[PDB]
């Protein structure tokens, strides 16, 4: 089947992780509290009552884990820097122990020939910024993020050449501020009674605006002060479901395109064209912030590459409604669409463990072509792709390792990826599996197993290779 030869010369293969999901050591070496420490320690927020205080303890076990990557022949590792290990209070006194830790990790990776692809922000805002000004809701976050980013460029950018400023700003905006299902857990209480505060109709657009400005601010610093000498690149990882029309009719075809504009375009149109999608301006109206001319000029062009986190594809239909006033405004209603993995009662594909994750390999190819055509063939990295098993206490570890479904998932998505590059002309530069190890899946806690390696939570976090480890090792052989 697939080999390295199925992909362009120099194509980069890796696994991906995130600090809060992997590291543990939440109180160690000066680390500041984050909005996810607060959220994980709040009743009702995590489905299995768990937390990531220890997680899979990668803070102490990264060398063991790096050898696991090297065992497969991985080229690269995507990981995040916990902001609160560098500035425990978000701004102010740098925490030297945080710098020293990430230097050891970066050096250990490079010692093994594995390139670091580093995410600056993977959701773990210092609680001090949430406390001071409600974090992403305030324009101050722009300057504060840019300063944190600058410290990372200054400390690590002699060795780190691939930066992802933000991970999934769309997920954060919607899950954090419309549904209130992720930190800081804000929403319109009239829509979801579990929330303490928020406004599903307004806050997501404010947060998204600030994310875009925050990236632009970091990128401006990078280009002006670091890029010439360091010779690296900056991008973002966008969460992107592919959307197929629920019917092959012009109304639903327009609906699927619209749902795409509201998901990827919300962020990517500003970065390529200097403004939000016209459909968002039309439908969200005054609730959607406006860029100034000077802001547009710093935002347009601020990506060196587009990271795509892609798992699944849904059907999308047009939706007509007649909302009962401002009170019930929400992002989904604003799109004028509804998207579901079901058509005429039939699911779009087999499903992984996650209730949202449908297995639809063709959507990888369809998305790569959409990005090519809409954005004039920018460089793309698949910054996340993978699937999860359940955490099943009724089966042996040995049986837990037989992840044949995961193998078929990667095989089929990568086959479609290879085709988009070779047949379709898409400029895809690399691919990162979610994830290296089983880990703490946010509000799903330890109920979801995404790892190439199985982690025994009952035996001091012992790592065992699932069948997919051998499969990747064989794929990556030279
Ligand atoms: C891509 C569109 C799918 C929509 C919503 C689900 C978003 C996935 S969150 C994303 O993927 C991993 C696996 O879920 C997380 O654990 C990572 O930390 C995070 O980066």
Curated annotation (Swiss-Prot):
**Family label:** Belongs to the glycosyl hydrolase 1 family.
Highest taxon of the source? Eukaryota
Q: How does it assemble?
A: Homodimer.
Q: Where is the active site?
A: 168 (proton donor), 384 (nucleophile)
Coiled-coil annotated residue ranges, if any: none
One Gene Ontology term, aspect cellular component: extracellular region
Sorted UniProt keywords: Disulfide bond, Glycoprotein, Glycosidase, Hydrolase, Secreted, Signal
Q: Which InterPro entries match?
A: Glyco_hydro_1, Glyco_hydro_1_N_CS, Glycoside_hydrolase_SF
The gene for this chain is BGLU6
Reaction(s) catalysed (UniProt annotation):
Hydrolysis of terminal, non-reducing beta-D-glucosyl residues with release of beta-D-glucose
What SUPFAM superfamilies does the annotation carry? (Trans)glycosidases (SSF51445)
Q: Cite the pH-dependence comment.
A: Optimum pH is 4.5.
**What does the UniProt entry list as the effect of changing residue 384 to D?**
Decreases activity toward gibberellin A4 beta-D-glucosyl ester 70-fold
Query: Where does the protein end up?
Result: Secreted
Q: Which residues are glycosylated?
A: 248, 319, 329
Name under which the protein is recorded: Beta-glucosidase 6
List all disulphide bridges recorded for this chain. 187-195
Q: Which Pfam families match?
A: Glyco_hydro_1
Tell me, what is an example of a GO biological process annotation in this record?
A: carbohydrate metabolic process
EC numbers for this chain: 3.2.1.21
Residues reported in the UniProt entry to bind a beta-D-glucoside? 21, 122, 167-168, 311, 384, 434, 441-442, 450
Physiological role: Hydrolyzes glycosides, oligosaccharides and hydrophobic glycosides. Possesses gibberellin ester beta-D-glucosidase activity. Can hydrolyze gibberellin A4 beta-D-glucosyl ester in vitro.
What is a GO molecular function of this protein?
A: hydrolase activity, acting on glycosyl bonds
């Amino acid at each position: 089947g697939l080999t390295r030869g199925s992909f362009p010369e120099g194509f980069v293969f890796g696994t991906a992780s995130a600090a809060y999901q992997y590291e543990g050591a939440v109180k160690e070496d000066g680390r500041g509290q984050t909005i996810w420490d607060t959220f994980a320690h709040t009743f009702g927020k995590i489905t299995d009552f768990s937390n990531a205080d220890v997680a899979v303890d990668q803070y102490h076990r990264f060398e063991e884990d790096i050898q696991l990557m090297a065992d497969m022949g991985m080229d690269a590792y995507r990981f995040s820097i916990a902001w609160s290990r560098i500035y425990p209070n978000g701004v102010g006194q740098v925490n030297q122990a945080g710098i020293d830790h990430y230097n050891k990790l970066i050096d250990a990776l490079l010692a093994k020939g594995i390139q670091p692809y580093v995410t600056l922000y993977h959701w773990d805002l210092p609680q001090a910024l949430e406390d001071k000004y409600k974090g992403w809701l305030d324009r101050q976050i722009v300057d504060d993020f840019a300063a944190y980013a600058e410290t990372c460029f200054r400390e690590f950018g002699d060795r780190v050449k691939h930066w992802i400023t933000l991970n999934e700003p769309h997920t954060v905006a919607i899950q954090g501020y419309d549904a209130g299902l992720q930190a800081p857990g804000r929403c319109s209480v009239l829509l979801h009674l579990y929330c303490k505060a928020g406004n599903s109709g307004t806050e997501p657009y404010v947060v998204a605006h600030h994310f875009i400005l925050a990236h632009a601010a970091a990128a401006s610093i990078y280009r002006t002060k670091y890029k010439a000498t360091q010779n690296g690149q900056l991008g973002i990882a966008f969460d992107v479901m592919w959307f197929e029309p629920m019917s092959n009719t012009t109304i639903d075809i327009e609906a699927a395109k619209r749902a795409q504009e509201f998901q990827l375009g919300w962020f990517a149109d500003p970065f390529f064209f200097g403004d939000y999608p016209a459909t968002m301006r039309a439908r969200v109206g005054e609730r959607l912030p406006r860029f100034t001319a000077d802001e547009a000029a710093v935002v347009k062009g601020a990506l060196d590459f587009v990271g795509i986190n892609h798992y699944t594809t849904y059907y999308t239909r047009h939706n007509n409604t007649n909302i009962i006033g401002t009170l019930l405004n929400n992002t989904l209603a604003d799109t004028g669409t509804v998207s579901l993995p079901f058509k005429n009662g039939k699911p779009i594909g087999d499903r992984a463990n996650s209730i949202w994750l449908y297995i639809v390999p063709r959507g990888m190819r369809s998305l790569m072509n959409y990005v090519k055509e809409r954005y004039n063939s920018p460089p793309v990295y698949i910054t996340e792709n993978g699937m999860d098993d359940s955490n099943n206490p009724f089966i042996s570890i040995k049986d837990a390792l037989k992840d044949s479904k995961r193998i078929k998932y990667h095989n089929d998505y990568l086959t479609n990826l290879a085709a988009s590059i070779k047949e379709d002309g898409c400029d895809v530069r690399g691919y990162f599996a979610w994830s290296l190890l089983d880990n703490w899946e946010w509000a799903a806690g330890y109920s979801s197993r995404f790892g190439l390696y199985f982690v025994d939570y009952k035996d001091n976090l012992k790592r065992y290779p699932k069948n997919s480890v051998q499969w990747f090792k064989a794929l990556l052989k030279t």
